[PDB]
Scaffold this motif. Structure first.
Motif, PDB file in Angstrom:
ATOM      1  N   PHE A 190       0.850  -1.190   0.000  1.00  0.00           N
ATOM      2  CA  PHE A 190       0.000   0.000   0.000  1.00  0.00           C
ATOM      3  C   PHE A 190       0.870   1.218   0.000  1.00  0.00           C
ATOM      4  CE2 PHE A 190       0.146   2.299   4.048  1.00  0.00           C
ATOM      5  CZ  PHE A 190       0.805   1.371   4.883  1.00  0.00           C
ATOM      6  N   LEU A 191       2.169   0.997   0.128  1.00  0.00           N
ATOM      7  CA  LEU A 191       3.182   2.028   0.268  1.00  0.00           C
ATOM      8  C   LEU A 191       3.193   2.538   1.680  1.00  0.00           C
ATOM      9  CD1 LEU A 191       2.804   1.754  -2.765  1.00  0.00           C
ATOM     10  CD2 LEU A 191       3.127   4.173  -2.877  1.00  0.00           C
ATOM     11  N   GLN A 192       4.256   2.200   2.394  1.00  0.00           N
ATOM     12  CA  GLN A 192       4.287   2.263   3.851  1.00  0.00           C
ATOM     13  C   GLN A 192       4.113   3.682   4.365  1.00  0.00           C
ATOM     14  N   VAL A 193       4.620   4.633   3.591  1.00  0.00           N
ATOM     15  CA  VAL A 193       4.425   6.052   3.871  1.00  0.00           C
ATOM     16  C   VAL A 193       4.227   6.725   2.516  1.00  0.00           C
ATOM     17  CG1 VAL A 193       5.343   8.153   4.859  1.00  0.00           C
ATOM     18  CG2 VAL A 193       5.942   5.975   5.924  1.00  0.00           C
ATOM     19  N   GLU A 194       3.261   7.642   2.426  1.00  0.00           N
ATOM     20  CA  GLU A 194       2.966   8.284   1.144  1.00  0.00           C
ATOM     21  C   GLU A 194       2.767   9.782   1.234  1.00  0.00           C
ATOM     22  OE1 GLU A 194      -0.498   6.513  -0.507  1.00  0.00           O
ATOM     23  OE2 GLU A 194      -1.609   6.717   1.369  1.00  0.00           O
ATOM     24  N   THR A 195       2.669  10.423   0.051  1.00  0.00           N
ATOM     25  CA  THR A 195       2.873  11.883  -0.085  1.00  0.00           C
ATOM     26  C   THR A 195       1.897  12.728   0.726  1.00  0.00           C
ATOM     27  OG1 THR A 195       1.521  11.894  -2.085  1.00  0.00           O
ATOM     28  CG2 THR A 195       3.906  11.960  -2.381  1.00  0.00           C
ATOM     29  N   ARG A 196       2.393  13.903   1.114  1.00  0.00           N
ATOM     30  CA  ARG A 196       1.569  14.952   1.679  1.00  0.00           C
ATOM     31  C   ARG A 196       0.894  15.843   0.622  1.00  0.00           C
ATOM     32  NH1 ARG A 196       1.803  11.964   4.950  1.00  0.00           N
ATOM     33  NH2 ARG A 196       2.479  12.090   7.130  1.00  0.00           N
ATOM     34  N   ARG A 197      -0.369  15.576   0.285  1.00  0.00           N
ATOM     35  CA  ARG A 197      -1.191  16.527  -0.437  1.00  0.00           C
ATOM     36  C   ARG A 197      -1.398  17.773   0.465  1.00  0.00           C
ATOM     37  NH1 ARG A 197      -7.241  14.866  -1.563  1.00  0.00           N
ATOM     38  NH2 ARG A 197      -7.626  15.892   0.445  1.00  0.00           N
ATOM     39  N   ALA A 198      -1.420  18.952  -0.156  1.00  0.00           N
ATOM     40  CA  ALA A 198      -1.634  20.206   0.562  1.00  0.00           C
ATOM     41  C   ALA A 198      -2.380  21.212  -0.309  1.00  0.00           C
ATOM     42  CB  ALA A 198      -0.309  20.772   1.065  1.00  0.00           C
ATOM     43  N   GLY A 199      -3.512  20.788  -0.864  1.00  0.00           N
ATOM     44  CA  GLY A 199      -4.329  21.643  -1.703  1.00  0.00           C
ATOM     45  C   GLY A 199      -5.240  22.575  -0.941  1.00  0.00           C
ATOM     46  N   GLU A 200      -5.839  23.522  -1.655  1.00  0.00           N
ATOM     47  CA  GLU A 200      -6.734  24.521  -1.054  1.00  0.00           C
ATOM     48  C   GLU A 200      -7.669  25.114  -2.131  1.00  0.00           C
ATOM     49  OE1 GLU A 200      -3.803  27.032   0.665  1.00  0.00           O
ATOM     50  OE2 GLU A 200      -3.300  28.070  -1.220  1.00  0.00           O
ATOM     51  N   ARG A 201      -8.107  26.372  -1.973  1.00  0.00           N
ATOM     52  CA  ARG A 201      -8.971  26.982  -2.969  1.00  0.00           C
ATOM     53  C   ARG A 201      -8.366  28.231  -3.606  1.00  0.00           C
ATOM     54  NH1 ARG A 201     -12.006  31.305  -1.934  1.00  0.00           N
ATOM     55  NH2 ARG A 201     -13.293  30.725  -3.747  1.00  0.00           N
ATOM     56  N   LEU A 202      -9.228  29.144  -4.033  1.00  0.00           N
ATOM     57  CA  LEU A 202      -8.914  30.337  -4.815  1.00  0.00           C
ATOM     58  C   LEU A 202      -8.453  29.822  -6.179  1.00  0.00           C
ATOM     59  N   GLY A 203      -7.142  29.694  -6.294  1.00  0.00           N
ATOM     60  CA  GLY A 203      -6.531  29.075  -7.460  1.00  0.00           C
ATOM     61  C   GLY A 203      -6.382  27.586  -7.243  1.00  0.00           C
ATOM     62  N   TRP A 204      -6.881  27.099  -6.118  1.00  0.00           N
ATOM     63  CA  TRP A 204      -6.745  25.727  -5.715  1.00  0.00           C
ATOM     64  C   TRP A 204      -5.259  25.328  -5.763  1.00  0.00           C
ATOM     65  CZ3 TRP A 204     -10.721  27.307  -9.008  1.00  0.00           C
ATOM     66  CH2 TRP A 204     -12.046  27.138  -8.531  1.00  0.00           C
ATOM     67  N   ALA A 205      -4.517  25.781  -4.754  1.00  0.00           N
ATOM     68  CA  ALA A 205      -3.069  25.641  -4.728  1.00  0.00           C
ATOM     69  C   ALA A 205      -2.655  24.300  -4.141  1.00  0.00           C
ATOM     70  CB  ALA A 205      -2.436  26.776  -3.947  1.00  0.00           C
ATOM     71  N   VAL A 206      -2.534  23.310  -5.008  1.00  0.00           N
ATOM     72  CA  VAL A 206      -2.004  22.016  -4.605  1.00  0.00           C
ATOM     73  C   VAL A 206      -0.548  22.207  -4.242  1.00  0.00           C
ATOM     74  CG1 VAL A 206      -1.475  21.325  -6.982  1.00  0.00           C
ATOM     75  CG2 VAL A 206      -1.687  19.608  -5.202  1.00  0.00           C
ATOM     76  N   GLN A 207      -0.101  21.476  -3.227  1.00  0.00           N
ATOM     77  CA  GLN A 207       1.198  21.701  -2.627  1.00  0.00           C
ATOM     78  C   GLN A 207       1.761  20.450  -1.965  1.00  0.00           C
ATOM     79  OE1 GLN A 207       1.152  25.128  -0.045  1.00  0.00           O
ATOM     80  NE2 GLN A 207       3.371  25.144   0.284  1.00  0.00           N
ATOM     81  N   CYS A 208       3.073  20.424  -1.741  1.00  0.00           N
ATOM     82  CA  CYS A 208       3.751  19.299  -1.102  1.00  0.00           C
ATOM     83  C   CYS A 208       4.882  19.792  -0.210  1.00  0.00           C
ATOM     84  CB  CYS A 208       4.298  18.326  -2.139  1.00  0.00           C
ATOM     85  SG  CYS A 208       3.044  17.517  -3.112  1.00  0.00           S
ATOM     86  N   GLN A 209       5.329  18.920   0.688  1.00  0.00           N
ATOM     87  CA  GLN A 209       6.357  19.291   1.647  1.00  0.00           C
ATOM     88  C   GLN A 209       7.700  18.619   1.394  1.00  0.00           C
ATOM     89  OE1 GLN A 209       6.176  21.774   3.845  1.00  0.00           O
ATOM     90  NE2 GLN A 209       4.074  22.161   3.145  1.00  0.00           N
TER      91      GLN A 209
END
Lengths: 318, 107, 541, 613
Positions: free
Chosen positions: D6-25
């Protein structure tokens, strides 16, 4: 020359002082492994047995075996009442190894080492002499029991083969050294210690070992050794028969030769010491009589001429 | 022969010259995309004098076209690479090399 | 039993010029060998096992040939086949002395000839001669009227296991030879002992099965040395030559011989290799017999009929034979590795190759580099591996069936964060089959791994379809700068798509599409990188 | 459908609104093997289910680990091209790999990089050849016990990691980051194992520890770690704990090896401090003898004292030579045998090797000393050039190959120390190595430089020449066709040494002449006999007699053969010449002169040889 003098100082401070009798530890080491599905001393013995039992064509110099075999080798009427406590202490130590199968270990090691005369064999014999020393019945019986319960065949091939080599004395070798018996000592002390306590069954076992596929008579071998050894002694007499006065090297190693022939006539007499008539008949039809004859030549003339001067009476004595 | 292609722009000024200690990150993959090398795996930048012939000819000629800060895909010709010999154990004979070079700085 | 001379009696070694007839005294290695052995058969059927009596007539019988020793006018003294061995030519007797010099005993009889001690002059009663020898190490023996005193031959018993082994050699040769002669009959005749043979094969394999690890060490080493001994005991008598020439004659076919037989054949051959393996599991010398023969094994490696057994064979050859590791060169390893390509990831194969690579102790470096050049650089074969960075994609909540458009401004690209360049493919994709599971998705995974996918940007921008990195040119010829604004277009029914960097065209691109999917925009991303969606806050119109 | 990880650890999604700013750490990475044949990538962490490929691949790791080949390095760079450095480090850091794979990648990190350097290091670690530097003076057997001190010095040649470059000797890693990593791994292991949480990392405790203790063990035998990290190790062992942990009969072996490095290093410090005292005391005593060869005997007079007030200083330091790992090692070995009935004999042999090292460290010193050899501080750099060369030949002992040994033996020939310190050379046992390679070669044109080496090794000293003399039966059995002139060099000089030889050797040689009834080999053998008998001046009788008795029977109108050789190749005449020369070097023993007059019977040969000018 400071590096030179320092290396030299390492050589001299190793030549002496470092040679303290530290070896007193060894004894306690044994009991430290005696402490208690077995015991550590037993673990180590069974490990070496594990090593002996493997085929290897010829055994490698197992340094650790030489070391622990030497360790176990060192592990073993008011004077009479002390003597009973001392002999019983010795028997306690020898049983301290005996219960842990060390006898069969020695036996398998001499077996495995076959006809080479490695120093490691010398250690096996040191340990064997350490185990038997006084002529334990327990050990002789477990060893005979080992040798019948497992018909090795090659055990006596080992003793025979090394005894075909062994050590003698040699004339030319002295003639060129002019300008090593300890192992034969250990070995025939070994064969004597196998037969001490008048073990008829084991002497007869030496005479033939019936269960094995190849009979091998240790006694006729031993007499063969006593024979070549007198031959060397006699020739060594003709080296000095004209010379009257004897070199100290000729009075030293010759004495060693006497230690050998003594350990060996002790082995034969230990082989015949019981009235095991069969071993007697075996050794009688063997070419020993040539050998007692030849010592009688050496024991005639050396016995006369060594008397001639005071310095040699010591060598006449032995 | 060798065919360097720009990936990302550099300053567009400071091209490699004789005697300079070129400092680059890179990666190395085959025609099949099979990577055989990668400087970032070490996280240690690679340093070579250019024209000193310590490197393969395609690297020795093609990096010169690159600018400082520039990233470039050096599709070096095998003949300018290890050639018909091929680098033992890694590069097959007559294998065209594909680099994703990134020249950090001339020195 | 063996006949020690003081060294022992034997005949010529297997595959001799002699045709194994002439007798020889010999010392050395033969003393442990089976051909040194000699069964002693008294003429009586009954009570033969009664103690051997001095002077009673007795046929002597070499075991491994099965043949009886005999005086013969044709070739002097010779061991010979029993069919020719009438008792008059072959009688003999053991005696205390050279001087010359009765009633049968139906009983075990009086004790006499002890092994190794009761010396026994041989004599041929039918002729009254003696087993003299003439005066290399082949001290040849012939019968003669006199004979000097050291001629005495004290007896020595064979081990049970060993005589069993030897008689077993007689049965074994005597079955396989006629097997071979029967194989020859149809080799030139397109159109046989068999199940008789196979039982012998399975039984010889059982007879050589190495001891279990489960056994305690002492019994293990005992059974093991007995194993090595029996291996040698079939070694001197050419059992390996026999099995190899049987394998030679059986390797001709992949089927002549009748179909009744051919059905068992696939077993037989394979069974033989198993048998063969058994002779070389342990003993080094038999592997030394394969040292010249390795190329043979290698060809038979490629046979792919009996298959794996030839490989286990070669592996037994390599595991215990520096000689064989030395002799091996380009072709053989290239054929081994080619087998690795021809079966697919038997681990046994790699075990064979590491066994090639390192002799017990010493390395064999030419072989090592040869393993490298014939494996590693191609990369196509064995499981290659790498530390890939994760790709991960996100889409706007609503998909698309008229015409449509969306911007996606880039925000913060970090180029080589970690070893990989950060992933930022962006573009259309259908719902029905695009399932970008984050953990490994063909190739090294990521957006654009599928026909379903229709993507753009990342690493010089340009595009991916199927998986191919097609490098469409753009006026900027740039990646995706954090300042950059990706731009994407699509039409219903019409399969057109086209992209713009910072509001200007990046040429035409890929065309024809399934309408089976319901298209949605996709933004793949990796590392810490972030991007603004712009479904319409457009900064370009 | 196919189940997968299942993948032991997986990505941090960090989306939002306005321009819908998808983001990662932060970055995350698969350890992804692929199958090119199916062109399917897969993370190796998944591999612990489709375990057939686990077997295959763990054996691929056996193949890399094998092909790196112990003492090979040209191959290893390619292995850098494949296994990948970073991939190794990620292979170590994560603790979810199935264990044969895990231990396989630790084994690779050992082999591809650390192992060859460890082979260069260990054999020299056995040697104790200390410089007389001022740094090697303030050592002191005690701190003003505890091993792992930074003052260990000696010489012990530096590691040579060539960086794994692929544009155009041994592969490189960051040694310090890696020592820290492995250290953190032992710490994490002691912690997680100490709470007895039972993942257990490798699916076994064995995999949880053995590869890691291995990596640390080679890493530490290598001499990487710097005082305090070694302290971390010992605190993770004794503490004064991994040592007190319950263990599988496997990890215990690695503890036996690691602890063996501690005890061996303790021997290093002991012998070294004793040598430092050789300086600190001999500098004093030499002033005493000069205040007032055989000088060694006088030094033995200095050594008679225990049975000139400087003697008391000896009377303290010897008691320093008397010496708490000495507690724990014996106690722990004895506990291990006591509670378990350990099997796997290797672990046992390690245990009681440790144990015998513990109860007899004075004797461990007594065996350690001959290999130890003090050296003048100025010259040591040459030895630094020397030792590495030996490493090279010691790399060749376990195997083109030939060119290396040639250039290396030549580099040893060039060294000043090889002149100045022969005792060090025989103490290294290096001639035994060169002979060992010499015999492995025999069974060409690499033999030759080796013979020049053993011959000159005979030249440099006589005491060393006997050291070469010990091997003559071996050297002659090895000489089927040159080692024989090496033996000749062994016999060439000392008369006592020519007397020391056994008749069996000359018998072997004359048996070789028995094999020469068909040659040059024979004149070679005759030449060895020539040095064997003739010695310095009139030939020794003790050997000459035996040689003639042997030549009565073996080296077989014979004088006509000279003129038959003249009618011509001439090497047969060189054989007859060598023979008549060897008989020309032999003169109770009056009768042998008749034996030689029996073969003047010459006369015509001098005339025929003069006519052939």
């Amino acid at each position: 020359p400071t590096h030179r003098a320092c290396n030299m100082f390492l050589e001299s401070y190793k030549a002496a002082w470092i040679l303290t009798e530290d070896h007193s530890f060894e004894d306690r080491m044994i009991d430290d492994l005696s402490k208690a599905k077995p015991d550590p001393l037993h673990q180590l013995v069974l490990h070496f047995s594990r090593t002996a039992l493997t085929e290897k064509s010829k055994l490698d110099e197992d340094y650790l075996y030489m070391a622990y075999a030497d360790i176990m080798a060192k592990s073993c009427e008011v004077s009479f009442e002390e003597k009973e406590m001392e002999k019983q202490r010795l028997l306690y130590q020898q049983s301290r190894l005996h219960t842990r199968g060390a006898a069969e270990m020695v036996l398998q090691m001499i077996s495995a080492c076959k006809g080479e005369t490695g120093a490691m064999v010398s250690s096996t014999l040191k340990l064997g002499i350490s185990i038997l020393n006084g002529g334990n019945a327990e050990v002789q019986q477990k060893m005979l029991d080992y040798l019948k319960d497992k018909k090795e065949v090659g055990f006596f091939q080992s003793i025979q083969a090394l005894m075909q080599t062994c050590s003698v004395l040699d004339l030319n070798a002295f003639e060129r050294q002019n300008k090593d018996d300890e192992f034969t000592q250990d070995l025939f002390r070994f064969l004597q210690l196998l037969c001490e306590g008048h073990n008829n069954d084991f002497q007869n076992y030496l005479r033939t070992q019936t269960g094995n596929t190849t009979t091998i008579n240790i006694i006729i071998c031993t007499v063969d050794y006593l024979l070549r050894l007198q031959e060397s002694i006699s020739d060594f007499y003709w080296y000095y028969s004209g010379k009257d006065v004897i070199e100290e090297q000729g009075k030293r190693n010759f004495s060693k030769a006497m230690s050998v022939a003594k350990q060996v006539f002790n082995s034969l007499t230990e082989y015949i010491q019981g009235p095991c008539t069969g071993n007697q008949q075996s050794l009688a039809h063997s070419r020993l009589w040539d050998a007692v004859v030849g010592f009688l030549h050496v024991f005639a003339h050396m016995m006369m001429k060594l008397a001639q001067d005071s310095s040699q009476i010591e060598l006449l004595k032995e | 022969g060798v065919q360097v292609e720009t990936i990302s722009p550099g300053d567009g000024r400071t091209f490699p010259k004789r005697g300079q200690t070129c400092v680059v990150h890179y990666t190395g993959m085959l025609e099949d995309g099979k990577k055989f090398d990668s400087s970032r795996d070490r996280n240690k930048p690679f340093k070579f004098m250019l024209g000193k012939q310590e490197v393969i000819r395609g690297w020795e000629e093609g990096v010169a076209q690159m600018s400082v800060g520039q990233r470039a895909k050096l599709t070096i010709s095998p003949d300018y690479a290890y050639g018909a010999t091929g680098h033992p154990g890694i590069i097959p004979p007559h294998a065209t090399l594909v680099f994703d070079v990134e020249l950090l700085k001339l020195e | 039993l063996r006949l020690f001379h003081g060294e022992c009696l034997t005949i010529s070694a297997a595959d001799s010029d002699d045709q194994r007839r002439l007798v020889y005294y010999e010392g050395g290695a033969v003393c442990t060998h089976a051909r040194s052995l000699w069964r002693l058969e008294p003429l009586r059927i009954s009570w033969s096992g009664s103690h051997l009596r001095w002077g009673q007539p007795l046929r002597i019988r070499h075991v491994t040939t099965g043949r009886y020793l005999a005086l013969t006018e044709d070739q002097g003294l010779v061991v010979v086949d029993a069919c020719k061995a009438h008792t008059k030519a072959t009688s003999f007797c053991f005696r205390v002395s050279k001087e010359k010099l009765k009633r049968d005993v139906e009983g075990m009889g009086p004790p006499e000839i002890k092994y190794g001690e009761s010396l026994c002059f041989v004599q041929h009663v039918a002729s009254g001669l003696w087993l003299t020898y003439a005066a290399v190490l082949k001290k040849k023996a012939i019968l003669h009227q006199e004979g000097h005193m050291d001629d005495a031959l004290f007896l020595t018993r064979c081990q049970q296991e060993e005589s069993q082994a030897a008689r077993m050699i007689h049965s074994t040769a005597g079955l396989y030879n006629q097997f071979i002669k029967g194989l020859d009959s149809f080799s030139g005749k397109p159109r046989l002992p068999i199940e008789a043979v196979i039982l012998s094969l399975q039984d010889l394999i059982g007879y050589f099965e190495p001891p279990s690890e489960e056994l305690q060490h002492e019994e293990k080493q005992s059974k093991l040395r007995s194993l090595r001994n029996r291996q040698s005991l079939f070694q001197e008598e050419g059992m390996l030559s026999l099995v190899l020439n049987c394998i030679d004659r059986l390797n001709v076919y992949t089927t002549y011989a009748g179909e009744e037989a051919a059905e068992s054949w696939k077993e037989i051959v394979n069974l033989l290799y198993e048998l063969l393996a058994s002779l070389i599991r342990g003993n080094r010398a038999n592997c030394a017999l394969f040292s010249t023969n390795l190329d043979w094994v290698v060809s038979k490696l490629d046979r792919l009929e009996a298959s794996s057994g030839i490989l286990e064979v070669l592996y037994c050859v390599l595991i215990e034979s520096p000689e064989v590791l030395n002799i091996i060169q380009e072709n053989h390893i290239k054929s081994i590795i080619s087998l690795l390509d021809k079966h697919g990831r038997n681990h046994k194969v790699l075990d064979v190759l590491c066994s090639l690579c390192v002799c017990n102790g010493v390395a064999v470096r030419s072989n090592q580099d040869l393993i490298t050049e014939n494996l590693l650089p191609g990369r196509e074969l064995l499981l290659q591996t790498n530390l890939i960075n994760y790709v991960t994609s996100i889409r706007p909540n609503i998909f698309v069936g008229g015409k449509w458009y969306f911007e996606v401004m880039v925000d913060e690209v970090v180029p080589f964060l970690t070893a990989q360049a950060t992933h930022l493919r962006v573009g259309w994709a259908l719902t029905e089959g695009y399932s970008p599971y984050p953990g490994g998705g063909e190739g090294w995974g990521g957006n654009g791994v599928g026909d379903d996918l229709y993507s753009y940007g990342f690493d010089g921008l340009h595009l991916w379809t199927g998986h191919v990195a097609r490098p469409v040119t753009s006026p900027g010829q740039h990646l995706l700068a954090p300042e950059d604004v990706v731009s994407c277009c699509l039409d219903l029914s019409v399969p057109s798509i086209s992209f713009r960097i910072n509001g200007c065209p990046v040429q035409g691109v890929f065309e024809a599409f399934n309408l089976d999917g319901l298209f949605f925009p996709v933004v793949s991303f990796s590392a810490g990188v972030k991007v603004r969606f712009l479904l319409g806050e457009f900064k370009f119109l | 459908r196919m189940p997968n990880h299942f993948l032991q650890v997986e990505t941090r999604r960090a989306g939002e609104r306005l321009g819908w700013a998808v983001q990662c750490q932060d970055p995350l990475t698969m350890m992804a093997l692929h199958i090119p044949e199916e062109n399917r990538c897969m993370d190796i962490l998944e591999l612990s289910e489709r375990l057939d490929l686990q077997r295959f691949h763990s054996h691929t790791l056996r193949l890399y680990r094998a092909v790196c080949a112990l003492g090979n390095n040209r191959v290893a760079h390619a292995l850098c091209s494949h296994v990948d450095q970073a991939q190794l480090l990620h292979a170590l850091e994560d603790a979810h790999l199935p264990g044969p794979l895990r231990a396989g990648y630790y084994d690779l990190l050992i082999s591809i990089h650390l192992e060859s350097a460890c082979r260069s290091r260990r054999s020299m670690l056995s040697e104790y050849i200390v410089p007389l530097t001022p740094e090697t003076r303030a050592i002191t057997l005690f701190p003003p016990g505890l091993p792992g001190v930074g003052v260990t010095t000696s010489l012990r040649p530096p590691h040579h990691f060539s960086p794994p470059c692929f544009v155009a000797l041994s592969p490189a890693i960051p040694l310090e980051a890696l020592r820290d990593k492995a250290l953190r791994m032992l710490g994490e292991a002691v912690r997680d194992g100490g709470q007895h949480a039972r993942d257990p990392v490798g699916g076994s405790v064995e995999f949880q520890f053995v590869p890691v203790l291995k990596l640390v063990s080679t890493l530490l035998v290598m001499g990487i770690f710097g005082d305090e990290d070694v302290k971390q190790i010992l605190k993770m062992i004794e503490p004064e704990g991994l040592l007190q942990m319950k263990l599988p009969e496997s990890v215990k072996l690695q503890m036996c090896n690691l602890l063996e490095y501690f005890c061996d290093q303790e021997l290093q410090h002991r012998v070294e401090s004793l040598a430092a005292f050789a300086e600190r005391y001999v500098d004093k005593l030499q002033a005493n003898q000069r205040s007032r060869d055989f000088h060694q005997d006088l030094l033995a007079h200095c050594g008679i004292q225990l049975e000139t007030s400087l003697s008391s200083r000896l009377r303290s330091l010897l008691e320093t030579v008397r010496l708490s790992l000495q507690e724990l090692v014996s106690h722990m070995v004895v506990r291990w045998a006591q509670e378990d009935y350990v099997q796997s004999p290797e672990l046992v042999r390690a245990m009681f090797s440790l144990l015998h090292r513990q109860y007899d460290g004075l004797g461990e010193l007594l065996r350690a000393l001959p290999r130890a050899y003090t050296i003048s501080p100025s010259s040591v750099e040459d030895t630094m050039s020397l030792l590495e060369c030996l490493g090279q030949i010691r790399s060749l002992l376990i195997v083109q190959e030939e060119n290396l040994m040639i250039q290396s033996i030549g580099n040893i020939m060039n060294n000043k120390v090889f002149y100045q310190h022969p005792n060090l050379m025989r103490a290294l046992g290096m001639h035994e190595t060169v002979m060992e390679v010499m015999v492995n070669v025999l069974g060409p044109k690499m033999v030759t430089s080796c013979c020049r080496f053993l011959c000159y090794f005979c030249r440099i000293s006589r005491q060393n020449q006997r050291s070469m003399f010990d091997h003559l039966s071996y050297l002659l059995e090895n000489s089927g066709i040159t080692p024989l002139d090496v033996a000749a060099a062994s016999v060439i000089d000392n008369n006592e040494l020519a007397l020391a030889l056994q008749e069996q050797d000359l018998e072997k040689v004359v048996s070789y002449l028995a094999g020469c009834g068909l040659p040059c080999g024979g004149e070679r053998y005759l030449d060895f006999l020539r040095f064997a008998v003739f010695v310095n001046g009139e030939s020794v009788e003790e050997n000459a007699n035996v040689v003639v008795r042997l030549l009565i029977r073996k080296p077989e109108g014979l004088l006509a053969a000279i003129e038959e050789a003249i009618r011509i190749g001439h090497a047969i005449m060189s054989f007859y010449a060598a023979l008549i020369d060897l008989l020309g070097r032999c003169a109770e023993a009056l009768r042998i002169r008749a034996i030689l007059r029996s073969l003047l019977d010459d006369l015509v040969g001098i005339i025929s040889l003069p006519l052939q000018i």
